[PDB]
Ligand binder design. Structure first.
Ligand SMILES: *[C@@H]1O[C@H](CO)[C@@H](O)[C@H](O)[C@H]1NC(C)=O
Lengths: 535, 530
């Protein structure tokens, strides 16, 4: 070593890392970026569980983000900040199982609460390196240890021939889990308290957090959990073994291919080749069509999440959950005819019924009838502004809001401490049109503290809001309670209960309590609609 | 011999009585025969015109009430007795009543004809709440009301037979309307301006006259208060009527001809004894004998008929009251009584729904419960109680009334719609019933103007106001006072804007959408779910 900054050399079980002292608005942080936690899942290892990373010699350079797992790159709007902000920001490669650690500078003296981020991307995309997941502000301003991992997405992470040796399913979730294991063993080397790990994530990342709550080997690797705009239960986060087998077989044919032979063929296919076909598995017109998601394999998920959230014991569990004001708006522009980022997307009634078939592809004619009926404003059943907004609500309520409301309800009942929010602040910087409101995913930059970077052009009040939110999330990591134990001028955030159904609004104003999470409407999706899908 | 109380009608001479109304005298011709008594071989049969009479017939008193079940659920309770027959029961009952201003109108006066409700199993023109004296006096209206046959006597059909063709109670009504075309001028009435009005089954009857072509030439406007020809309760299929008829016959020990001949031989009270055993089906509206879709009087189900009809030259006033369903709960639904607050359990509510919507399959019941549950207070007994009322009101009245108002407007009528929200200070039902089925009639008819009745001074003004709405509609097709610039004007109900008004103590408020979402549930979804 000799001449290096002594505050930036740490040792983990695999060997020696050298980190980087990064600059944050109000001081420096330590970052150890691109630490490998698994043997690269390439060649013969494709589709297979991750193996722990064999120790290296010398000092690993952990100063830059690593490769991003092979994924489909969105090209709906070339040059558009609104979409590129989510696109990969490092080389694409199957060699991508690396995690990142942010800690205070100097790394803290007493052992600090850890926060682990699991990114979203509908299980087909995502990266711990994206700007909106920068751990530096949470590290610097809250003295938090923050960790985030890459996990395999799309076919590489989730294609399954359930029952087989070669492609058991859920390997993306298993990548995440091995990263949690890595945290237990090694986080202390950085001043992290492995007895205080809160998982947080958004969308498919939230669903991931939910599945760890639901999977036994993984329950011993964290204590608290945050699910933002996602759930393990619901229409898009899982597939039955049979369905997953159908899709895997189908994809195999598309690329030109006894389970051993099939997968052996698949494995001889170039990565890009699989990515080029992963969308053709469901011609089936469908927004939250994505073919490769966690399979209910009777192993990792011993049963469907709905079953498991109904009958598990969550007495020893604190969750924070919530949604943004406009969950579904975003999705409409990706294959509901009539919707665009470039006009005000006022649709016709005809375009609405047509969208309801696309948003709820698993719906009989009677079901679509029901949805349309429930979401039509009969005072103005022809008004395009309302219909546009209805279509958003439908997609939003079906995939996010009511799955979350269900999740909060069951959990609260089965003995958990649940806190619930609705995020209501549209970013002054947002580049999506006004009509989309506060779209899915646009709370992340606030929780991570991005508005504290003067150069990012957020308003002052947004900088105060960011800090407020960050306090909520870290307090929750620390105590299982978002409220401040000291400061009692600020309105309290009450637990969500079955009886009172209370949640709070997150916006530029002080906390306001509300009761019932889209109560009537979620009763429609969660209780009534299923029964209408008995033929 | 007051010559003002003396009239020559086509059948002969009549002598009325002079009646005392608060602000002056009214002429009155009670108990005028409009048909041959429908007795003996004439039971179940179409009414025939009454034969002429020698001398001066005494029309100074109310005639008999048509033979009907008498309510005994709450004996001696004012709430219930006021609906019960207030004269002798008899199958000889086809009489009508005319009220006119005294002295009798100097030029032809618009005529209002009342058709009482009672679910097609009860009711009388002679009840206190249909007293035509105030409308006659205060508004100078010629007001007519008739008895028509009810229950088995009026509605028992063996469709296609010559000897019990069905709908005779409606034909009774039609004949009274014919009688008015032919005789009302003699009272100062204008046969060129006949407005029908009725409540509940009287509303449905009014509606059936709208839908039946011979009736159409006998009136010019209509008011349907809290009832419709469409809906669950007002009509039956030819098939189902024949079933209920033969079942009633079998129940009293009885070929169409031979079956009816046998029924004809039975005392009236025998048929009424078994009237309520034709549908054991523990619903509320288990009344078995209602107008029948006969391909004759009703050329096709009302739904069909309102859907395809042409209502170009028609003005209609329709409305509901705030709490259509509360009244009925205490008759069938377990857990509901006039004597407590009827705060019910959830289980009670789900059982309540299978009763209030007896049509409902498991799923459709699920749907109703689902729709009406307040998922934020899903157990609160106050909500479940109020929900139950709502289920029953909406399904049988509010949504039918909306369905009709929409279709009439769409197909060219001119529609005015209200909701009645004022609870009579003198009501004797408990508070949890709100403003129940039937409790606007007393205001329309002008009862609070009679000081001996203890209605608040505000209520007396409110009644004057409603009497103006109704008679303005009668006079013009428009309820609005044409010497009232200052407004709140009452807007026509159009399918586009969907406006109605609140009838209560505060001045008119225009609201849009008569239970818009809930009635979409009843009218568009639930049908498909079956
Ligand atoms: C906006 O753009 C979409 C997508 O190309 C188009 O189909 C739609 O007609 C446009 N909306 C309107 C009506 O301006």
């Amino acid at each position: 070593e000799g001449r290096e900054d002594p505050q930036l050399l740490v040792r983990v079980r695999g060997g020696q890392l050298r980190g980087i002292r990064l600059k944050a608005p109000g001081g420096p942080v330590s970052a150890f970026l691109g630490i490998p936690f698994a043997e690269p899942p390439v060649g013969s290892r494709r589709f297979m569980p991750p193996e722990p990373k064999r120790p290296w010699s010398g000092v690993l350079d952990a100063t830059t983000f690593q490769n991003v797992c092979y994924q489909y790159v969105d090209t709906l709007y070339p040059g558009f900040e609104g979409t590129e902000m989510w696109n990969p920001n490092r080389e694409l490669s199957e060699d991508c199982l690396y995690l990142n650690v942010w800690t205070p500078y100097p790394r803290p003296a007493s052992p600090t609460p850890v926060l682990i981020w699991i990114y979203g991307g509908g299980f087909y995309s995502g990266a711990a390196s994206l700007d909106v997941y920068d751990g530096r502000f949470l590290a610097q301003v809250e003295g938090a240890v923050l960790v985030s991992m890459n996990y395999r997405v799309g076919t590489f992470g989730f294609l399954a021939l359930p029952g087989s040796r070669e492609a058991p399913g859920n390997v993306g979730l298993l990548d995440q889990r091995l990263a949690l294991q890595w945290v237990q063993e090694n986080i202390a080397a950085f001043g992290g308290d492995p007895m205080s790990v809160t998982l947080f994530g958004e969308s498919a990342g939230a669903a991931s957090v939910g599945m760890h709550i639901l999977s036994l080997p993984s329950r011993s690797l964290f204590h608290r959990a945050v699910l933002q705009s996602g759930t393990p239960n619901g229409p898009w986060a899982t597939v039955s073994a049979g369905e997953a087998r159908r899709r895997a077989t189908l994809l195999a044919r598309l690329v030109g291919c006894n389970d051993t032979e099939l997968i052996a063929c698949l494995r001889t296919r170039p990565a890009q080749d699989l990515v080029d076909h992963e969308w053709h598995v469901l011609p089936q017109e469908s927004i939250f069509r994505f073919s490769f998601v966690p399979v209910v394999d009777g192993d990792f998920l011993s049963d469907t999440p709905e079953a498991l959230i109904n009958t598990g014991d969550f007495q020893d569990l604190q969750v924070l959950v919530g949604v943004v004001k406009d969950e579904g708006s975003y999705f409409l522009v990706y294959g509901v005819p009539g919707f665009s980022k470039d006009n005000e997307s006022l649709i016709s009634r005809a375009q609405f019924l047509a969208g309801v078939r696309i948003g709820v592809p698993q719906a009989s004619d009677l079901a679509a009838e029901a949805v349309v009926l429930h979401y039509t404003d009969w005072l103005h059943p022809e008004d395009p502004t309302h219909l546009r907004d209805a279509m958003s609500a439908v997609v939003g309520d079906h995939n996010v809001v009511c799955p979350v409301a269900q999740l909060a309800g069951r959990l609260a009942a089965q003995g958990a401490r649940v806190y619930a929010y609705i995020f209501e602040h549209r970013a002054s910087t947002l580049t999506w049109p006004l009509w989309m409101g506060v779209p899915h995913g646009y709370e992340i930059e606030f929780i991570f503290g991005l508005p504290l970077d003067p150069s990012l052009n957020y308003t002052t009040e947004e900088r105060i809001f960011a800090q407020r939110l960050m306090k909520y999330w870290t307090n929750f990591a620390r105590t299982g309670d978002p409220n401040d134990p000291r400061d009692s001028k600020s309105p309290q955030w009450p637990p969500y209960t079955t009886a009172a159904q209370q949640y709070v609004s997150l916006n530029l104003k002080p906390l306001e309590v509300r009761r019932g999470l889209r109560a009537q409407t979620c009763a429609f999706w969660n209780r009534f609609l299923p029964k209408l899908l008995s033929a």
